[PDB]
């Protein structure tokens, strides 16, 4: 919903319970992923400075999942 008054929906409340799951689990997961690449990145600098770039390209990838999740939650709930 809106913070302003311009929404109402008996259906929507149920949609909020179900959608809270998807964002929350995607952020959990994306984070756990992120950490492995970040620890790996510590190693990457250690091995060779020049290919800090390699850590960067892999590291972008789990971000896509939360971001995708945020858009799904808005469409299903909060679009109006």
């Amino acid at each position: 919903a809106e913070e302003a008054a311009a929404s109402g929906g008996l259906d929507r409340g149920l949609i909020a319970v179900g959608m809270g799951l998807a964002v929350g689990l995607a952020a959990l997961g994306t984070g756990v992923a992120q950490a492995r690449i970040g620890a790996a990145g510590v190693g990457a600098i250690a091995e060779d400075r020049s290919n800090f770039g390699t850590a960067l390209i892999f590291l972008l990838l789990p971000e896509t999942l939360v971001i995708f999740g945020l858009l799904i939650a808005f469409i299903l709930n909060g679009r109006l």
Binding site: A39, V42, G43, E47, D48, R49, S50
Partner: protein
């Protein structure tokens, strides 16, 4: 399983490790004063005679009860992780044991301490009269170093070859298992051990006319086939392009002794900063390199004192 008790047992033990300032004192001492000093330490606690055979024995026996008793104290997933570390000290025993059976020489004048294969496994193996039976007796503790041995023994019964293909196959075995047991601390170290091995295989076999690709096995960080080939021609300009690795210090160095000194000091360093990761195998990792290196300096300081060698000949090799 689990390292929870075991790490804790080692943390008390890290208290009685020999700090840098002992070896500093020891160089200033004669052999008589060295002996009084040595007896304060935990290596001193196994001492049985003033002379050289006895110093080598007190050191070894200290390593047998405080370090070589670690794989028994854990089981499973813990045990495989700790085991890979222990395995290098077991390979040293194995290569000598394999050589006493084959060339017919006595059981004696070999390295024995417990690790992963017990003392009795080495005695039952010794007394075995078929190489295949010798191999099943070794396969009883369970470890990747059996599986490595077993394949090499199928191709050959020639001593020099079994020794080389076992070592090559063994570090390859180690690497795959280790990558699958995770942790950043172990991975960084593993990479260095393989990189160091690669350099070192190239040095030992230098100029034998052989293939340079045989001295490079996966696990690397910055080293490759071409550096090996140039190195094999006798060119050390390859080490002068080697930076971004902690072997930055090998640049402008061309003596085999300085080069190899360098690799052992680098490996020491990685392990000593693994105590910012003491969870799991990290701490044990640091503990084994330090007990090994410590034991080595007391043996060098004892030799240096007994025979009255020059001070600078050993002062440099007892510090990193």
């Amino acid at each position: 399983d689990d390292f929870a008790y075991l790490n804790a047992r080692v943390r008390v033990r890290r208290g009685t490790l020999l700090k840098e300032s002992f070896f500093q004192e020891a160089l200033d001492l004669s052999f008589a004063d060295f002996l009084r000093l040595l007896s304060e330490t935990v290596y001193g606690g196994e001492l049985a005679g003033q002379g050289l055979p006895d110093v080598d024995r007190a050191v070894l026996r200290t390593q047998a009860k405080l370090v070589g008793d670690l794989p028994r104290l854990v089981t499973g997933e813990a045990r495989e992780a700790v085991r890979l570390l222990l395995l290098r000290n077991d390979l040293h025993n194995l290569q000598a044991l394999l050589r006493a059976k084959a060339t017919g020489r006595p059981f004696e004048e070999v390295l024995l301490l417990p690790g992963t294969l017990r003392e009795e496994v080495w005695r039952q193996a010794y007394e075995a009269q078929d190489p295949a039976g010798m191999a099943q007796v070794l396969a009883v503790p369970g470890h990747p170093l059996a599986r490595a041995l077993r394949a090499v023994l199928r191709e050959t019964q020639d001593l020099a070859r079994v020794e080389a293909l076992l070592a090559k196959r063994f570090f390859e075995d180690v690497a795959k298992a280790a990558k699958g047991l995770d942790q950043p601390a172990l991975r960084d170290y593993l990479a260095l051990e393989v990189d160091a091995e690669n350099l070192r295989t190239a040095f030992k076999l230098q100029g034998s006319g052989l293939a340079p690709d045989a001295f490079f096995l996966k696990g690397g960080r910055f080293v490759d086939r071409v550096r090996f080939a140039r190195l094999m021609e006798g060119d050390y300009a390859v080490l002068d392009e080697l930076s971004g690795t902690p072997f930055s210090g090998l640049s402008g160095v061309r003596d085999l002794k300085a080069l190899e000194r360098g690799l052992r000091c680098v490996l020491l360093k990685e392990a000593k900063k693994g105590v910012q990761d003491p969870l799991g195998v990290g701490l044990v990792l640091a503990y084994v390199k330090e007990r090994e290196w410590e034991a080595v300096r007391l043996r060098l300081l004892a030799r240096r004192a007994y025979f009255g060698l020059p001070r600078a000949q050993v002062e440099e090799e007892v510090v990193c």
